[PDB]
Amino acid sequence: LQNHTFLHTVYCQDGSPSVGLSEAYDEDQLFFFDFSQNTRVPRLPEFADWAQEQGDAPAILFDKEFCEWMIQQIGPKLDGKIPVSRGFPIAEVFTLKPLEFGKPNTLVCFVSNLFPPMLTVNWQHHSVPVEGFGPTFVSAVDGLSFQAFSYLNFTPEPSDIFSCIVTHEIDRYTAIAYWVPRNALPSD
Amino acid sequence: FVAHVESTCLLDDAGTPKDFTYCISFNKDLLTCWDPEENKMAPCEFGVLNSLANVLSQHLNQKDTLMQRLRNGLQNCATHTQPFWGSLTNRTRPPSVQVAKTTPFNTREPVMLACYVWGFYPAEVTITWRKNGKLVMPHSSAHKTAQPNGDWTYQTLSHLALTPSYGDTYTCVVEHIGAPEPILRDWTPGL
Ligand SMILES: *[C@H]1O[C@H](CO)[C@@H](O[C@H]2O[C@H](CO)[C@@H](O[C@@H]3O[C@H](CO)[C@@H](O)[C@H](O[C@@H]4O[C@H](CO)[C@@H](O)[C@H](O)[C@@H]4O)[C@@H]3O)[C@H](O)[C@H]2NC(C)=O)[C@H](O)[C@H]1NC(C)=O
């Protein structure tokens, strides 16, 4: 009988989003809380049924308010006194499945070392903006850190060149990761 | 600044609560956590933010609802994860696997094979190579590290540098708890 970790992270900050709550089972995100909608959102459809139970609303409320209290009351007092912890976001891009020209695939943009948790991800195809599939998932990970996943559905072609642009929100820093078609698997 | 109010629960495959933590952090500095053998929040930081750690511990320790809540942390962990835990600790997804040639690197060999393994869960996976039915590269790391896709699936790849001979058949053997039997993918120079 091996152990497994259920991580429930309530975090808040000076900036947007001002507050968040991420939950994970070992390395994977289970839910994220939408405070504007008062509800847990499932990372995957199959977790939809479990995202309904709200037996811990008061605990979430307690933690939320205490968190916002530290940023609001404490913080302005530490402002200038201690150096603000900050980490440059590191982005990497890769296909969800092995490359096969003309076949539907999905590009993944994984962002790590994100701190504070404020970002925007933009996808481009040959220097041309293109909207991604679904939202960008920001989650908390062990060690008071954050990461994010973004996806782009596409059908790879020999001349393709894509890029994932990560903005550590409000122009703190901008990272860019490029993806080029290589070692494509032979088609039938 | 960024602040944290993080809870963690350690449970086994059965849903039995083994551990539980509740810690407050500020500016990515762990300041104070719940101390069961004391029934209160106790400082963890003894550096510059030590006084803040004591101030936060104080304010929280005066919250009866929180004290009663943390005293029952272990039970809360089991009760809360109860509806889905079993479905997670039992969750598995079999890996898809394909072999093909790839541009050689860090080698003198003329050919390099890539065994692609993806769509699997959990992340633990073992890959070995067989030449005409016999194991090769014994001193390699069969226990591979995998890249998470963020959607509860993982992927990894193993390489094999070689010189082709038309009669040789190379087989990528993949083992994963999500698959009852080993998964094999063959490759030959004339394919
Ligand atoms: C995951 O789940 C649990 C997470 O913590 C974990 O639980 C226990 O882990 C240890 C088991 O090896 C426990 O360690 C013991 O702690 C005692 C208190 O300090 C010690 O007195 C005790 O001493 C040892 O006793 C042994 C038996 O006589 C002896 O062989 C040693 O020489 C030594 O004298 C031992 O160190 C730990 O307290 C437990 N954690 C908790 C509940 O607080 C699980 O082990 C872990 N499970 C898996 C599969 O990883």
Ligand SMILES: [Cl-]
């Ligand atoms: Cl909880």
Ligand SMILES: [Cl-]
């Ligand atoms: Cl090892």
